Design a protein around this ligand. Structure first.
Ligand SMILES: O=c1ccn([C@H]2C[C@H](O)[C@@H](COP(=O)(O)O)O2)c(=O)[nH]1
Lengths: 132, 140
């Protein structure tokens, strides 16, 4: 009926590979935080490498095609993958947190802050996630 | 209908600020790439600072609570926002790309693991065909 969200895909991946994926927000061991940092740094470096390639080709006058974007698109998705992966390993529903950030960002656009603007309250999202 | 995805939320956000983005994959101006790179670097640095802070509290002997994770979770979601933001400005359906990357990541399950925990690739592993995703979206 509906495809899984990208956040739910990360849950499937971590279960498939035996990586920690708690049901509820869970303070992690330092080894997990270190790995998440390393995976983010790896993905971030590949994105930058591909952006630099495209800028260098444009500087030389190349007319980029849609297909020329595929390496960059791949690395940007890898960066999503390990960003979702950090939230999943923390036991934090990424869609619930993203929804709150989106609420605050979109509400901010509807104003310059609008009158009763409420910034993102991720602590509240964390507390509600513990109590399902 | 199916609920909106986070990539669809970015498309909604870009329209709402009056900067509607392409519906199909579209090569961007160089200015667009340099701006998206800066946003990614700043969001990445915010995340790194929060991870460093949690690691420093743990190395001090402090016990983290779930509530202590909210600043990190916030900055990770901000990073999602600017990463999805980049794909949306390129006119590239993030969910289509992500689905194919996901399929190729699930096929790594039989591979070995690195000392830090990273899942590595088994022999015979084949990468995702993101060129095929872009081609499919471009014609469609
Ligand atoms: O432990 C891991 C190992 C790999 N990946 C995903 C992130 C990227 O989508 C892609 C990067 O893998 P490498 O190409 O760096 O091996 O696999 C993870 O999420 N967790």
């Amino acid at each position: 009926p509906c495809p899984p969200t990208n956040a739910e895909r990360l849950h499937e991946f971590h279960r498939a590979i035996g990586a920690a994926t708690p049901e509820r927000p869970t303070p992690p061991p330092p080894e997990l935080l270190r790995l998440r940092q390393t995976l983010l740094d790896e993905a971030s470096a590949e994105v930058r490498a591909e952006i630099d390639h495209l800028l260098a080709r444009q500087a030389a006058g190349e007319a980029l095609s849609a297909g020329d974007l595929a390496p960059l698109a791949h690395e940007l998705a890898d960066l999503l993958y390990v960003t979702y992966g950090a939230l999943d390993q923390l036991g934090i529903d990424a869609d619930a947190v993203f929804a709150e950030v989106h609420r605050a960002n979109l509400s901010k656009a509807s104003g310059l802050k609008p009158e009763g603007w409420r910034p993102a309250d991720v602590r509240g999202v964390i507390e509600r996630l513990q109590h399902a």
